[PDB]
Amino acid sequence: AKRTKKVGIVGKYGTRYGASLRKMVKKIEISQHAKYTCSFCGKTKMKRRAVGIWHCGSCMKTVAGGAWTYNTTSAVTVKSAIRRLKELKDQ
Amino acid sequence: GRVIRGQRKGAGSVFRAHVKHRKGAARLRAVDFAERHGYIKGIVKDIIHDPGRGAPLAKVVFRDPYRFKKRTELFIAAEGIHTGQFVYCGKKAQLNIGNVLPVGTMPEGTIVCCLEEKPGDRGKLARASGNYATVISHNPETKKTRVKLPSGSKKVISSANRAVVGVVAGGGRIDKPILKAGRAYHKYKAKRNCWPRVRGVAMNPVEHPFGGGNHQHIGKPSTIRRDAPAGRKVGLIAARRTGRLRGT
RNA sequence: GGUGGAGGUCCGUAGCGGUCCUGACGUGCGAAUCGGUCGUCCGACCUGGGUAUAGGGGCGAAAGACUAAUCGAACCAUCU
RNA sequence: AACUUUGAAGGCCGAAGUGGAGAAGGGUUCCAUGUGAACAGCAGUUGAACAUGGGUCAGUCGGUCCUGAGAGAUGGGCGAGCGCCGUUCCGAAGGGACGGGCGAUGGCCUCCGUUGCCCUCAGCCGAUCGAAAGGGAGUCGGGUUCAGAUCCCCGAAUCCG
RNA sequence: AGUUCUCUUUUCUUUGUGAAGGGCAGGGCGCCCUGGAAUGGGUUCGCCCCGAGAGAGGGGCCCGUGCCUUGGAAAGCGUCGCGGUUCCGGCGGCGUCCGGUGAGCUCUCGCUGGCCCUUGAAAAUCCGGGGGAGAGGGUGUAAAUCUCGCGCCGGGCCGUACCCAUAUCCGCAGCAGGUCUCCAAGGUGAACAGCCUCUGGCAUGUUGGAACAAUGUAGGUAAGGGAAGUCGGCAAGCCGGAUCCGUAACUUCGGGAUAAGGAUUGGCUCUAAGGGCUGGCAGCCGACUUAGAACUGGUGCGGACCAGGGGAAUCCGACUGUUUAAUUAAAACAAAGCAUCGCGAAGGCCCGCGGCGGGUGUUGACGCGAUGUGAUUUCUGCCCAGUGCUCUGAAUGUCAAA
RNA sequence: UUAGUGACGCGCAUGAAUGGAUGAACGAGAUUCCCACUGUCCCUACCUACUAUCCAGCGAAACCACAGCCAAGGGAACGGGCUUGGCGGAAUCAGCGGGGAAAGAAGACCCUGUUGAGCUUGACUCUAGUCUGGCACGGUGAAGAGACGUUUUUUCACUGACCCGGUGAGGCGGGGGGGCGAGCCGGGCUCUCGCUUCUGGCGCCAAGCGCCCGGCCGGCCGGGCGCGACCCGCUCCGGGG
RNA sequence: CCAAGCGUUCAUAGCGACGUCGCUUUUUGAUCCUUCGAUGUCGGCUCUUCCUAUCAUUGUGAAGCAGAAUUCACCAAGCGUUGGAUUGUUCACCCACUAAUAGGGAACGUGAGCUGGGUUUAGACCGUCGUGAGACAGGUUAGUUUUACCCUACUGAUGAU
Ligand SMILES: [Mg+2]
Ligand SMILES: [Mg+2]
Ligand SMILES: [Mg+2]
Ligand SMILES: [Mg+2]
Ligand SMILES: [Mg+2]
Ligand SMILES: [Mg+2]
Ligand SMILES: [Mg+2]
Ligand SMILES: [Mg+2]
Ligand SMILES: [Mg+2]
Ligand SMILES: [Mg+2]
Ligand SMILES: [Mg+2]
Ligand SMILES: [Mg+2]
Ligand SMILES: [Mg+2]
Ligand SMILES: [Mg+2]
Ligand SMILES: [Mg+2]
Ligand SMILES: [Mg+2]
Ligand SMILES: [Mg+2]
Ligand SMILES: [Mg+2]
Ligand SMILES: [Mg+2]
Ligand SMILES: [Mg+2]
Ligand SMILES: [Mg+2]
Ligand SMILES: [Mg+2]
Ligand SMILES: [Mg+2]
Ligand SMILES: [Mg+2]
Ligand SMILES: [Mg+2]
Ligand SMILES: [Mg+2]
Ligand SMILES: [Mg+2]
Ligand SMILES: [Mg+2]
Ligand SMILES: [Mg+2]
Ligand SMILES: [Mg+2]
Ligand SMILES: [Mg+2]
Ligand SMILES: [Mg+2]
Ligand SMILES: [Mg+2]
Ligand SMILES: [Mg+2]
Ligand SMILES: [Mg+2]
Ligand SMILES: [Mg+2]
Ligand SMILES: [Mg+2]
Ligand SMILES: [Mg+2]
Ligand SMILES: [Mg+2]
Ligand SMILES: [Mg+2]
Ligand SMILES: [Mg+2]
Ligand SMILES: [Mg+2]
Ligand SMILES: [Mg+2]
Ligand SMILES: [Mg+2]
Ligand SMILES: [Mg+2]
Ligand SMILES: [Mg+2]
Ligand SMILES: [Mg+2]
């Protein structure tokens, strides 16, 4: 059964810290505790070990990722930019 | 009056960095013949949390070109590198995330991290989590490069300075509210004795310029000149302006 | 409807603290203790030993607090 | 003899103890015998008092060794100077070794040791101190005294060299 | 051994086996081989696992502190009975037995998960592997060599008593203070609560006797009223456990909430339901629970103990946290959040008499340093004259030494 | 109802991060009212324990000019003493709190002192630090502008002082040698390169070749050198200066 | 005290101008004589006593005293003079009962009698003021109340000549 209407994971904090801060931290709490599909082995096991450190329990690979998400939008953009500059550099 | 807290921070004592569980200084490779003239290969063995640092660190292993040994380096982990990956350092390394190249060979607009302030210093700029520098331009005649730093300042550096391609991992860390004094207690228990911070107006005049009064007020302007003596230089130090930053 | 068992979460012991009685005592058991009643009790928690900071100095989640019953500048000897 | 000892009753602490053992601190207060001057805020035939004598046994339980936060010499620097800073930093920082070649001495003189020199090889990169709660091989059962016992004796083991 | 007037095949006590070696249970494996799975299956309290190989078969390894065995019955213990100098490790008989059970408590081993802007020592020391420089003998009188089984010798130095705390320590003392730990029984009960008891311990806390006046200190009880007392309900009192029902304003939708408000609760005799093992059934074992019913007492039943009074509002501070050791615990401090300011290292901020000195810094702007405000919500208006801070400067008044 | 709450607002002297307004939850924080409850009270009583009490033993201390009954008087303007009156009778016990302007501590308040100390600043006089100019360390060379071959100054360079960073000071500069390209009439040059990028392997302690030498009987056994691994150089390599 | 007036009339039932004479020390002042090697600083509570300048009650005289109610005066302090809301309050105001709800002193009686609400230390907030440290007969909140066993007095208890 649905146990809360809107707090969800930030129901652990009760009434404290304010609705907007709890609303903000809810987005991060879901993402930083999610299990992502590993791109090396395909199993949904990519889990955060520390801030910025993501580890897959199946293939044992470790990845330098984002603080709360597996990869950041900034890092994804930079990889494409570095890929494009590499082609032009050697044509 | 007595010596103020800011004065006492300089003597070391209870204000020294908490470095008991840190893993070592994060650095590039020391520049040698392989990086000067070609490239050297390495393998990312592990990516580890460093107490007190937001960014993760990568443990990279190289071969020693002169002795039968394995060299373990401790790099700032660029975002997207994984264990078992091969990284390459040197003049002729390819433009890939995690490789170490001189900024002179990088095309304009390259995104780099752990960039040398001076050629050979082994990486000093843009090392915080999520941060990076950019390459603006080169002057092959003067053998120098123009980069943009995470603060936004533009700097002219030698073209021979090395850097790691990509941005530092662990980005977006400051986007999470701490929500708790206790969580800030733990953040700084790994760094140094700087928390919590008592306000100047909350003290007596003996230990602070702003202390004292029947009302908690500064009483004197809080923008303090650049040349004020230690123990007086408190508040907004040499402020060019104050108030809300409205506009660009 | 169940399962699950988070929390600077709540009642409450050990522990840690010390609100009120303006209770006891006030040539005291005690140069600060005693009783009931009370705060908190997974955390910014409690605590042993080691080690560091020394007097216009330290150290202070800040009361001019603490720095060996001494603190709006310790104690000791000297100047005297 | 209200208070000591024995016996018997009636009670209390009520396994977070008023029980059984340690650390720090004490330092003989421990145990036996004697005294009842002084002390133990009454008394005492009693005491942790006084007096006369005893009592602490280890490869295996700790220290001892390691490093921790840290402390601290040398090189160097500073300093009128006692000295101070500094701990890898302005240093010719190794007194070692498989092996090989030249000799010298000895002995179970057969040939091997030891020993001197030369050749060869050599990162550790920091003297030293720092924990009776951290790391750190290996001992247990029974008996035994007034007081000691995983230490003594009996039996059975084990680590290191 | 106790009780035995009556009853009680009763109540109480007690009923071993060390280290090390061997074997075997048990536990664990992210170890191997066959094979190839959707009608997906396996599986936990939860999870979680699989074509990167699931189920199902057959193996391997690690720990085995459990049991057996050597130790080892010779000892220890219980009990009965004999001896001595009788201060003997004295000598004999018998015994040291068979099962069950548990979210029980304590310890431990293991598996699996959660939390971190926290990621939770170093070294001495020991080991395995990769390589193959070398060495060993020429078929024997075998050699180099051996982390295998026996056997031989040694292990020095210092500590070691006792107290460990309402009398061995610190507070001038045998001071109601302070002072770090380990073990931890039965009953009631949710319980390391309180109350009673066993093992162990003690003698009432630096004296006794006799009285039972006032005034005290500490406990109680009071007709009728019910805060009229007092600055103020200070103090005391009321409520209180559990089950069943029921629960508002407001709210940041998490709460408020044990809101508020009711009913019930003992004893006894029953009924039903909830499981395991062996071979839709049969038999044999069992662990406390829940619900319901009758009967029953002078309506007494959470019978002691344990154990929230409640509601409507206003001010302040968001909260948890901290503080004037010894008159102030608070609205003060901190806090997350918010906003400013300096700094790209020959740097910012700071220490230092001193230097190629030192802290931040094992750091690098998502950082470090310096201030203000003080969660969230909503907003943060006008003023650069003053005082500050800051920016430009040979264009340029005053302006030291040289 | 000098209290509380809600309104009003020309507000002595409210007001926007010297933050304004709010608001759930929370509070040993301040305040008002209501239910319940009661000895807070009307208005007190009784009971229990330990005292006090009396006894045996044992046994302090604070304090003390002499002392210790009052009325009035006058008096340093509130007498235990003095004057005038009232009056006065051993030694003691339990209580008590009127007095002793009781004890306690050379008044903290207030003033004075040519006595201080903590703190502040637009006080006076200084001072660490800091910014700034000059002189020295402190050099080499080109230009520009001046002054009379010398000399001042500006710019640009240099390195060798001086500083910084890295490293176990491990391949620096120049030349040679070699490879792919270009292009002029096979050779010379423009000019560039120095052998590693797929995979979570391995990688040292030289192979090979050339030339010498030793011991033993062309054959065995064993050494030395060189190339492999280019040569020459004055700062280890960079960055400043 | 005088008496212009008021009181329909009428100075004096009851009042009383312009003037003037006193008393009191429960108001505030003025002064600075005592106390700064300290006389505990408001209010309440509690408890006794005293004054009279009499509110009530007893006995009376006078009224513009018909009665009732009331007013003025005399002897007079024997006995009374209350319960409450707001406030720390003294003071004040209101509710209610009453014969009446009088006024005062006793070191502005009374803190080794209490309480500690206010004032009046150190913490903290607001406003105004100050550049500031800080200040404010301006608000606010929290803030240790010591000793009797001596002498006397008093209360009771033995006793003494
Ligand atoms: Mg100052
Ligand atoms: Mg303060
Ligand atoms: Mg809690
Ligand atoms: Mg709680
Ligand atoms: Mg008290
Ligand atoms: Mg007393
Ligand atoms: Mg702390
Ligand atoms: Mg200092
Ligand atoms: Mg203060
Ligand atoms: Mg004990
Ligand atoms: Mg003992
Ligand atoms: Mg005695
Ligand atoms: Mg003894
Ligand atoms: Mg030193
Ligand atoms: Mg040592
Ligand atoms: Mg040790
Ligand atoms: Mg032995
Ligand atoms: Mg299987
Ligand atoms: Mg036997
Ligand atoms: Mg091998
Ligand atoms: Mg012992
Ligand atoms: Mg007793
Ligand atoms: Mg006794
Ligand atoms: Mg005692
Ligand atoms: Mg006692
Ligand atoms: Mg009653
Ligand atoms: Mg009644
Ligand atoms: Mg009242
Ligand atoms: Mg009253
Ligand atoms: Mg109360
Ligand atoms: Mg409520
Ligand atoms: Mg309001
Ligand atoms: Mg608070
Ligand atoms: Mg603290
Ligand atoms: Mg205090
Ligand atoms: Mg307190
Ligand atoms: Mg500000
Ligand atoms: Mg301005
Ligand atoms: Mg009221
Ligand atoms: Mg109002
Ligand atoms: Mg504004
Ligand atoms: Mg304001
Ligand atoms: Mg006596
Ligand atoms: Mg006198
Ligand atoms: Mg006389
Ligand atoms: Mg008196
Ligand atoms: Mg006095």
Ligand SMILES: [Mg+2]
């Ligand atoms: Mg004085």
Ligand SMILES: [Mg+2]
């Ligand atoms: Mg004084």
Ligand SMILES: [Mg+2]
């Ligand atoms: Mg004078």
Ligand SMILES: [Mg+2]
């Ligand atoms: Mg002075």
Ligand SMILES: [Mg+2]
């Ligand atoms: Mg001073």
Ligand SMILES: [Mg+2]
């Ligand atoms: Mg001046």
Ligand SMILES: [Mg+2]
């Ligand atoms: Mg007339």
Ligand SMILES: [Mg+2]
């Ligand atoms: Mg005078």
Ligand SMILES: [Mg+2]
């Ligand atoms: Mg005079």
Ligand SMILES: [Mg+2]
């Ligand atoms: Mg006096």
Ligand SMILES: [Mg+2]
């Ligand atoms: Mg007095």
Ligand SMILES: [Mg+2]
């Ligand atoms: Mg009269």
Ligand SMILES: [Mg+2]
């Ligand atoms: Mg008075």
Ligand SMILES: [Mg+2]
């Ligand atoms: Mg008095």
Ligand SMILES: [Mg+2]
């Ligand atoms: Mg008093």
Ligand SMILES: [Mg+2]
């Ligand atoms: Mg008060």
